[PDB]
Amino acid sequence: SRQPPLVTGISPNEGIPWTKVTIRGENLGTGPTDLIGLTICGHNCLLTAEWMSASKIVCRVGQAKNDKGDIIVTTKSGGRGTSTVSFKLLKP
Amino acid sequence: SLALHKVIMVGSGGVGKSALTLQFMYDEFVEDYEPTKADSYRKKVVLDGEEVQIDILDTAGQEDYAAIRDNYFRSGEGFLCVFSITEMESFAATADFREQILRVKEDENVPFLLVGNKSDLEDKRQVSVEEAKNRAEQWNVNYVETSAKTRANVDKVFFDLMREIRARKMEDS
Numbered sequence A: 001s002r003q004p005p006l007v008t009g010i011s012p013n014e015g016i017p018w019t020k021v022t023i024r025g026e027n028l029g030t031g032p033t034d035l036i037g038l039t040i041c042g043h044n045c046l047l048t049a050e051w052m053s054a055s056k057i058v059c060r061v062g063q064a065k066n067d068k069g070d071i072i073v074t075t076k077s078g079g080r081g082t083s084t085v086s087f088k089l090l091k092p
Numbered sequence B: 001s002l003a004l005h006k007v008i009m010v011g012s013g014g015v016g017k018s019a020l021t022l023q024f025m026y027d028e029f030v031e032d033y034e035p036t037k038a039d040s041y042r043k044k045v046v047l048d049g050e051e052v053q054i055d056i057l058d059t060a061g062q063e064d065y066a067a068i069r070d071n072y073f074r075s076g077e078g079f080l081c082v083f084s085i086t087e088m089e090s091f092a093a094t095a096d097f098r099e100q101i102l103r104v105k106e107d108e109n110v111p112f113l114l115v116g117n118k119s120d121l122e123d124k125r126q127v128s129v130e131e132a133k134n135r136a137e138q139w140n141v142n143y144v145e146t147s148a149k150t151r152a153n154v155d156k157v158f159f160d161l162m163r164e165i166r167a168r169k170m171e172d173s
């Protein structure tokens, strides 16, 4: 249906585990129920993901499984997305 | 493979660094309070007909940063030095930011723009246009007044800064 999610903003761009981050972009979901995937640094953050608008999702980062700060959003309407920015997971 | 211009937003707290960024990035403006630590934005934009990518590092206003600023500043190619026309204090603070930037980049001619934000609040102006202009000329940089609310000159400051970074990359390559 719609186009793939594209994350173009991350606030903040780094932080300790369980930091609350605001994700900005395009096609992040046509609604609250449209969101079916949210991985940051390989970590599944879907459970804490709160859809705000098609350009905004808020969630909490978790301990990394990857070393790349990739922000992958997946919607039912547009499929798996990509990000232009990365998140840096910090250690306490 | 596209050109990538790295812009950095600097200035005191509450002057509108984020508002300017979010209006430019997502065409929005909301009267909200949300102090920044460090946020990253990057998207495709068309500069003078050519598709490029702009990257924006939106930073914290609080001067609680010293060695942290150095790293951020070093990664940037151009800077938007923002202050609010309604807060003289933020204007006087620009001298410091300028100093810190020139230092790390070791370049007095680094792409730079002095931005007087919140132009829509003329009734609360504390910094005169004349004063702001004089400082900009002293530093040899352009001065532009903006409004993240009405979006006046917002696109202009980002485009002009990119053109400077662009020109700069022409000379060095």
Ligand SMILES: Nc1nc2c(ncn2[C@@H]2O[C@H](COP(=O)(O)OP(=O)(O)NP(=O)(O)O)[C@@H](O)[C@H]2O)c(=O)[nH]1
Binding pocket: B011, B012, B013, B014, B015, B016, B017, B018, B019, B020, B030, B031, B032, B033, B034, B035, B036, B037, B059, B060, B061, B062, B117, B118, B119, B120, B121, B146, B147, B148, B149, B150
């Ligand atoms: N009327 C008006 N309000 C503005 C303008 N720019 C920012 N504001 C308001 O001023 C407040 C602070 O803006 P904000 O972007 O958070 O400032 P900042 O410089 O990013 N803050 P910090 O340094 O703490 O990260 C917000 O409530 C915002 O809506 C403007 O041009 N006009």
Ligand SMILES: [Mg+2]
Binding pocket: B017, B018, B019, B034, B035, B036, B058, B059, B060
């Ligand atoms: Mg901010």
